[PDB]
Write a protein that binds this DNA or RNA. Structure first.
Ligand SMILES: [Zn+2]
Length: 252
DNA sequence: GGTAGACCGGGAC
DNA sequence: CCCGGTCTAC
């Protein structure tokens, strides 16, 4: 799920779990548990705690309990569902939180690629994976100024810059390519080569792209197809180690 | 500062 | 073997 999808999950999941008390935690793929390192300690500490809230940072979900916070990343295919303990689990279910009311919060993932960390609430923000995470792209904390500061300091491509979680929180490959197209900037451009004008334009399109989604693609996955703005075939290459889609006419 | 390795497996070769 | 995100290793 991309950032906007994670925000939707946050919004819809909260009322389904708030006020419920954990009676058990079942783990079928321990590797998902990253902290505590021992999945048995992870399970034990959550028992008896009530869900008090649910927040999002980047693509991370932060479940707020009595004493602890559970930090969860779904990666690309992870999913949460709330359902009865009486019904069979869906395929690829790796972690289940059982509540005292007979309902469960279940985590699935065919790719088995997601992560979970639990810390005392007061510690969560200074520990992995939230430590060092950049500002929310929709927050004033993410400004053209902040972006310009990071761009000049580096010799990396602009795409590499935007993919950096310390620069801005949870901006995925898709939204990076879409934003750069909308800003008219080639993804391979050195970040330091961007003018002040281009930086402002880029920040503006980043906010608009992610903002609209939170509330159809120009380039992502459209290689070989005509650009929707100029009709030039969209091309795909590799930049910053990712599939990279762009219009060679619209972007400079 | 920066990269590479690490984790995964459905679908492509 | 590739690919996505984000971490530890170096
Ligand atoms: Zn174009």
């Amino acid at each position: 799920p991309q950032l906007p999808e994670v925000e939707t999950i946050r919004r819809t999941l909260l009322p389904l779990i708030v006020g419920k008390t954990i009676e058990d935690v079942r783990i079928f793929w321990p590797n998902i548990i990253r902290h505590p390192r021992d999945s048995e300690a992870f399970a034990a500490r959550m028992i008896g705690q009530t869900v008090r809230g649910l927040e999002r940072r980047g693509k991370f979900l932060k479940f707020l309990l009595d004493r602890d916070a559970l930090i969860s990343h779904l990666r690309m295919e992870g999913r949460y569902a709330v359902a009865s303990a009486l019904e069979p689990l869906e395929p690829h279910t790796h972690v289940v939180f059982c509540f005292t009311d007979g309902s469960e919060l279940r985590y699935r993932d065919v790719r088995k690629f997601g992560t979970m960390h639990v810390y005392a609430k007061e510690e969560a923000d200074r520990r992995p994976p939230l430590a060092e995470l950049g500002p929310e792209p929709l927050s004033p904390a993410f400004s053209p100024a902040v972006l310009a500061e990071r761009a000049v300091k580096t010799k990396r491509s602009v795409k590499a810059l935007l993919l950096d979680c310390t620069v801005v929180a949870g901006f995925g490959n898709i939204y990076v390519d879409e934003s750069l197209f909308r800003a008219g900037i080639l993804p391979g451009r050195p970040a330091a080569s961007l003018s002040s004008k281009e930086i402002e334009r880029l920040h503006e399109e980043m906010v608009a792209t992610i903002g609209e989604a939170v509330m159809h693609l120009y380039v992502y996955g459209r290689q070989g197809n005509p650009c929707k703005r100029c009709g030039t075939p969209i091309e795909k290459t590799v930049v910053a180690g990712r599939g990279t889609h762009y219009c060679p006419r619209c972007q400079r």
